[PDB]
Design a protein around this ligand. Sequence first.
Ligand SMILES: CNC(=O)c1cc(-n2ncc3cc(Nc4c(F)cccc4Cl)c(CN4CCC4)cc32)cs1
Ligand SMILES: CCCCCCCCO[C@@H]1O[C@H](CO)[C@@H](O)[C@H](O)[C@H]1O
Ligand SMILES: CCCCCCCCO[C@@H]1O[C@H](CO)[C@@H](O)[C@H](O)[C@H]1O
Length: 348
Amino acid sequence: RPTFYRQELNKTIWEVPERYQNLSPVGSGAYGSVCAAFDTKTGHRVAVKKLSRPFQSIIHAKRTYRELRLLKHMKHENVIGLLDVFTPARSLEEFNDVYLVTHLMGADLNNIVKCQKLTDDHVQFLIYQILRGLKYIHSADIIHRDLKPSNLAVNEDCELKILDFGLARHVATRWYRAPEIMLNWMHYNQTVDIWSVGCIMAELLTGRTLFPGTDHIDQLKLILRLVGTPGAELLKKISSESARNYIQSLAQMPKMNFANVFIGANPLAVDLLEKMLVLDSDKRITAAQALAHAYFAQYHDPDDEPVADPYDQSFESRDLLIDEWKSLTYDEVISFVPPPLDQEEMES
Ligand SMILES: CNC(=O)c1cc(-n2ncc3cc(Nc4c(F)cccc4Cl)c(CN4CCC4)cc32)cs1
Ligand SMILES: CCCCCCCCO[C@@H]1O[C@H](CO)[C@@H](O)[C@H](O)[C@H]1O
Ligand SMILES: CCCCCCCCO[C@@H]1O[C@H](CO)[C@@H](O)[C@H](O)[C@H]1O
């Protein structure tokens, strides 16, 4: 067991192994508390996330287990990978905090979008990499659920990683969220993530948020103005007569012509966006289909877009006691095996 030291940053206490020095706080949210650190064992900068109140409630305890299981599974160039998982506790009964470590990236997509206007090549490469990571995530029967610029980060070569996963099942921007999530549809397609990609793509091309709603209903208002009020084929799938009546009571809006909306963009980029930002989730393009779209011809390689090992999420169906979720999480902390050093990191 490494020696731990304690330090307080922005009013939160960090207990970490000595190997991690120069802690500086990247951010703080109800989702988690994050700092940057220098890993004196590898010579690289790391991002360290502390889980808050991990076992305070059955919901939090299950959510703690869910995130560690997810992150332990992710082994893909364009998805966050775990370099270390640790707790200062030396016993399961002392166990009450969880820390997660990954490579510190250079900037997120909010700062890229504010720092520069992006060329079409840049947009191709960034969206290509999101879709490559997404193909892998969806191949494990996982939905990310919270793709957004702050959850996407790049290095100096514009190599991209998808970061924190959406942990809600059954403070937090709505701007990239698929309408059916906001409307409690309750059965979600993996294409909720494709909606988010489309919103992100649009913003990379224009530099402007596509749907910056002020609140829940404003978000839906802005969405319907672009893609139009639901069509007959979609209305067929809505059981509630009052919901249908409400929809038909709105001013009927046609879907706008994306070619006019995104005037000046690569016509192939506009075609892909039309295939992504479809109201009916059943009609949206999949990650695998999108990777074969002509917009990515310069980057697509069918033999280097790998898929995930099967992911056992039978736990999502379980109703267990708080102490059980805690014990399962502890077991996963103890069993964690760090990835090997990259070959490039070593010499002769
Ligand atoms: C100079 N560099 C910068 O300014 C930046 C680089 C970062 N960066 N890099 C990697 C990274 C990872 C996470 N999360 C995380 C973690 F920290 C440890 C283990 C597992 C996970 Cl998922 C977050 C936090 N989430 C919340 C919104 C992003 C930010 C991250 C972002 S900006
Ligand atoms: C009041 C206007 C709100 C319109 C929201 C669309 C209603 C979607 O509502 C959903 O319909 C599904 C299919 O019938 C059901 O399976 C889900 O339980 C229901 O939430
Ligand atoms: C006015 C509100 C517009 C909301 C329309 C969103 C329609 C999303 O699409 C729907 O997604 C559901 C999965 O969640 C599927 O079960 C339905 O088959 C599909 O039509």
